[PDB]
Amino acid sequence: SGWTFGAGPALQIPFPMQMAYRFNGIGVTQNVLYENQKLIANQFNSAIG
Protein backbone atom coordinates (compact mmCIF):
# COMPACT_ATOMS: atom_id res chain seq x y z
CA SER A 1 0.00 0.00 0.00
CA GLY A 2 2.92 2.39 0.56
CA TRP A 3 1.94 5.16 2.98
CA THR A 4 -1.85 4.99 2.54
CA PHE A 5 -2.22 2.30 5.22
CA GLY A 6 -1.13 4.80 7.90
CA ALA A 7 -3.36 7.70 6.84
CA GLY A 8 -6.68 6.02 6.01
CA PRO A 9 -7.94 3.18 3.83
CA ALA A 10 -5.32 1.00 2.19
CA LEU A 11 -4.77 1.71 -1.51
CA GLN A 12 -3.18 -0.89 -3.78
CA ILE A 13 -0.18 0.36 -5.76
CA PRO A 14 2.74 -1.37 -7.52
CA PHE A 15 6.11 -1.17 -5.77
CA PRO A 16 7.95 0.46 -8.73
CA MET A 17 5.30 3.19 -8.83
CA GLN A 18 5.71 3.69 -5.08
CA MET A 19 9.46 4.03 -5.64
CA ALA A 20 8.78 6.57 -8.40
CA TYR A 21 6.54 8.52 -6.01
CA ARG A 22 9.24 8.47 -3.32
CA PHE A 23 11.88 9.63 -5.80
CA ASN A 24 9.64 12.45 -7.05
CA GLY A 25 8.93 13.51 -3.47
CA ILE A 26 12.57 14.56 -3.01
CA GLY A 27 12.99 16.16 -6.46
CA VAL A 28 14.37 13.30 -8.56
CA THR A 29 12.36 12.64 -11.72
CA GLN A 30 10.69 9.27 -12.25
CA ASN A 31 12.53 8.66 -15.55
CA VAL A 32 15.76 7.52 -13.87
CA LEU A 33 13.72 4.88 -12.01
CA TYR A 34 11.39 3.80 -14.82
CA GLU A 35 14.41 3.39 -17.13
CA ASN A 36 17.20 2.15 -14.83
CA GLN A 37 14.93 -0.09 -12.77
CA LYS A 38 17.08 -3.23 -13.04
CA LEU A 39 20.14 -1.43 -11.66
CA ILE A 40 18.20 -0.07 -8.67
CA ALA A 41 16.74 -3.53 -8.04
CA ASN A 42 20.18 -5.15 -8.15
CA GLN A 43 21.62 -2.51 -5.81
CA PHE A 44 18.75 -3.01 -3.36
CA ASN A 45 19.20 -6.79 -3.47
CA SER A 46 22.95 -6.44 -2.90
CA ALA A 47 22.35 -4.12 0.05
CA ILE A 48 19.78 -6.49 1.58
CA GLY A 49 22.23 -9.37 1.15
Binding site: P16, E35, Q37
Partner: peptide
Protein backbone atom coordinates in the same frame (compact mmCIF):
# COMPACT_ATOMS: atom_id res chain seq x y z
CA UNK B 1 13.99 0.18 -21.54
CA UNK B 2 10.70 0.88 -19.72
CA UNK B 3 9.08 -2.35 -18.51
CA UNK B 4 5.29 -2.44 -18.50
CA UNK B 5 4.54 0.48 -20.85
CA UNK B 6 1.55 0.21 -23.18
CA UNK B 7 0.92 1.83 -26.56
CA UNK B 8 -1.54 4.73 -26.61
CA UNK B 9 -2.02 8.10 -28.30
CA UNK B 10 -1.66 11.53 -26.70
CA UNK B 11 -3.46 14.76 -27.55
CA UNK B 12 -1.77 17.91 -28.87
CA UNK B 13 -3.21 21.35 -27.95
CA UNK B 14 -1.54 22.94 -31.00
CA UNK B 15 -2.32 20.73 -34.02
CA UNK B 16 -6.10 21.42 -34.21
CA UNK B 17 -5.54 25.16 -33.71
CA UNK B 18 -2.88 25.28 -36.43
CA UNK B 19 -4.72 22.98 -38.86
Amino acid sequence: VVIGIVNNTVYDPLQPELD
